[PDB]
Amino acid sequence: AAYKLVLIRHGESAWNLENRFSGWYDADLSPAGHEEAKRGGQALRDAGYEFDICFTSVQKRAIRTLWTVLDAIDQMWLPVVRTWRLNERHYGGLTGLNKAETAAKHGEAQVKIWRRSYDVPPPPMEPDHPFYSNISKDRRYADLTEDQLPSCESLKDTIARALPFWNEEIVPQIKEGKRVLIAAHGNSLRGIVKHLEGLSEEAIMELNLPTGIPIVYELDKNLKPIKPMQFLGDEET
C-alpha cells in the first residue's frame, strides 16, 4: 500500500495498580508498563520498522512509551511532536478516585450510565478538587483557550479535540510520505481509529486497543485502510 502508520498505546501506569482514574493526571508507567513498552519496541525492531516523525501527548506515560520504543529501534534522533490533543480522556471529578470510591459516591446506576454512554460526561473537576491545581493550573496548558481546557470530557469530547490534530498536523505529514509513529492513550487513539475505519459510536466504545503492542495500518493515498489493523509481536501476543 501507499502508506504505513503505527500506533502504540502505553502500558500499565502507577495509578492502574491503584485502580484510580488518571485521565489528565500525569501518572508514570509502572515497571511492568515500562517492560511492555520495551517488548513493543523490540517487536518493531525485529520487523525492521523505520519512522520519520513521532507524535505523542504531553503525558509522561505515553512519552516514556515513545522513548522506550525509540531506544529499542535505535531511532532516538527522530523528530518528536508532543500535543495535549492526544492526551487521555479527562475524567473530571472522578480523577483520583478508585473503583470503590466511585461506586460509593455515585451508585452503580450512575456509574453504568457513564460507562456505556458516548456523550454524557463525568462530573466536572471543580476548584476544590484535590487535583484541580495539579492539572488545570499546570503551565503545560498555559496556552490553551478557556474553551479548550476541559473540566471533564465524554468520549465524544475527547475524540472531538483529538481529530483536529490528526487532520491538521498528522495527515499532511503522512501525505508528505513521512512514516508516522503515534504513541498515545486508549481514548485518543480511539478517536484516530474511529476516523480511519469509519466506526460507529457503539463500535468504537466496544473497541479496546491492546497495550504496549504496535498496531499497524496499511493505508491507500486517501488514508483509507486496505485491510484490518495488524498487531506486531510474537505469536502469543
Added chain:
Amino acid sequence: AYKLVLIRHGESAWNLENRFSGWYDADLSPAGHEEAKRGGQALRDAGYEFDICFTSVQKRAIRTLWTVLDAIDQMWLPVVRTWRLNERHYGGLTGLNKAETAAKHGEAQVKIWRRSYDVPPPPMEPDHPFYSNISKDRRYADLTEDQLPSCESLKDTIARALPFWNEEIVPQIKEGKRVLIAAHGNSLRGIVKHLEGLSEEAIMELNLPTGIPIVYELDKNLKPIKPMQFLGD
C-alpha cells in the same frame, strides 16, 4: 534578564570520549548516565523551568537531555534535534585512542591538529570502519554534499553550529522562552565563543565540564551580564 542553560553530556561507552567519538553515535556509559542524573538533580533542586529544548541527533546528547527532563519532571517540553549541534567530526581519527593516533600519523602532525583552529584531520575514507555507518546513516540523508562532513576543523564545527543558533535558538530566547541546550564539547564551544566574543586561542583553551548545568544570564542583546555559573554543590 534572559536565562540560558547548557549541559554537556558525560562519558560514552567503550572509552569513546577518549577516542575521538565525533560523529559515531556512541551511547552513554552507565557512569555518563549517572552524571546526567546528577545534573538533572541539580536543576530540579534549583527549581529551574524550561520552555523548549535543543539537542543534537546523537544519542549520548539526546539521552542526557531525556535524563534531565525526567529528573526535573518536564518530559512534556518541546524538543528540537539538529545535526548542527553534533560533536566535531574528527574524520579519520574517529574511534582511535591517543597512542594509535600518534602511531599512525606521528607526534608532530598530531600536535599540529591539537593546536590548530582551522586545520582539519584527514577525511574518513571508505576503509574506515565507521565510513558507511556514519556517512550512509539515514538521519543525514537530507544533507547536501557540501554539508555532510568527512572531517572538520574546530572552525568548521563552529561555522555549522552558529547558523542554527542564530536562526532557531536566538528567536526563542528573544520571545522569553527559557531554553535548555544539551549537546557536545565542541558545538557548545561554538555557542560560548559567540556569546562571550572569545578569540580562537581562548576557545581552544576552554574545556566545559560534563554533566553540570551551565547557566548564562543575558541582556536584551543576548550579551552575558556576568560569567557563566555552574550548578551543583
